[PDB]
Amino acid sequence: FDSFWFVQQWPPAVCSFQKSGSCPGSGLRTFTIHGLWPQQSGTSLTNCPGSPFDITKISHLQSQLNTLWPNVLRANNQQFWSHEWTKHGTCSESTFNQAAYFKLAVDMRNNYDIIGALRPHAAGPNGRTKSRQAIKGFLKAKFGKFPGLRCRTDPQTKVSYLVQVVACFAQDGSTLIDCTRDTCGANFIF
Numbered sequence: 001f002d003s004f005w006f007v008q009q010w011p012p013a014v015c016s017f018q019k020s021g022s023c024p025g026s027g028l029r030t031f032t033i034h035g036l037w038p039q040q041s042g043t044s045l046t047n048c049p050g051s052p053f054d055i056t057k058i059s060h061l062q063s064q065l066n067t068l069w070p071n072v073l074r075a076n077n078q079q080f081w082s083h084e085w086t087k088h089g090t091c092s093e094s095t096f097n098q099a100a101y102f103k104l105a106v107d108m109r110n111n112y113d114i115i116g117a118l119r120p121h122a123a124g125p126n127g128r129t130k131s132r133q134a135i136k137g138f139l140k141a142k143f144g145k146f147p148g149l150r151c152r153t154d155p156q157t158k159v160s161y162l163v164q165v166v167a168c169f170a171q172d173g174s175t176l177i178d179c180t181r182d183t184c185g186a187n188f189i190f
């Protein structure tokens with residue numbers, strides 16, 4: 001892998017697509033970790049042959065992960081961590097063992113406060129229309145690099161909602177780099 005996509009999700013937005021049933025994200029007004037996705041030549045590396053997920057390897061990060069990486073769709077964090085490790089983490093296992101991978105994600109989350117970066121610009125989530133360019137600009141100014149903005153469209157209304165913010169990192173997992181790929185259009189609800 002040559003870079004990482006540190007993907008954070010806005011729980012309420014992610015859960016806003018679940019039109020029925022419980023969804024913990026609905027009550028979590030803080031960006032949380034969706035996953036840390038290794039990339040290679042402009043593409044996501046997934047399902048690489050690697051070590052099976054081992055929950056004991058991250059007991060030391062468990063409390064932090066419960067807060068920073070909760071499963072926002074259902075009350076089962078481990079299932080989500082295991083899925084993210086197996087589908088993505090294995091792809092950077094050449095240099096980051098499971099413990100180091102989850103630690104990277106935790107550190108990245110603790111060093112990439114999106115709400116804190118948007119607050120000064122009154123660009124926090126309020127269910128109103130936001131500019132992709134403006135949001136990327138605020139984050140570019142705060143962190144020095146452009147984030148990636150990911151949106152999902154409500155099939156019934158055609159309204160686009162910001163669901164994830166990506167912080168791109170070099171293979172060292174510490175050097176923030178500019179993201180260039182967004183799934184969001186020029187405007188979206190946040």
Ligand SMILES: O=c1ccn([C@@H]2O[C@H](COP(=O)(O)O)[C@@H](O)[C@H]2O)c(=O)[nH]1
Nearest residue numbers: 034035070071072073074080083084087
């Ligand atoms: O809080 C979350 C966010 C996403 N997912 C799940 O993870 C997958 C999306 O992540 P990915 O496979 O593209 O890494 C989907 O199956 C989705 O339901 C969860 O279980 N919990």
Ligand SMILES: O=c1cc[nH]c(=O)[nH]1
Nearest residue numbers: 005037042043044181
């Ligand atoms: O991780 C991802 C997802 C989509 N497209 C990419 O280039 N990387």
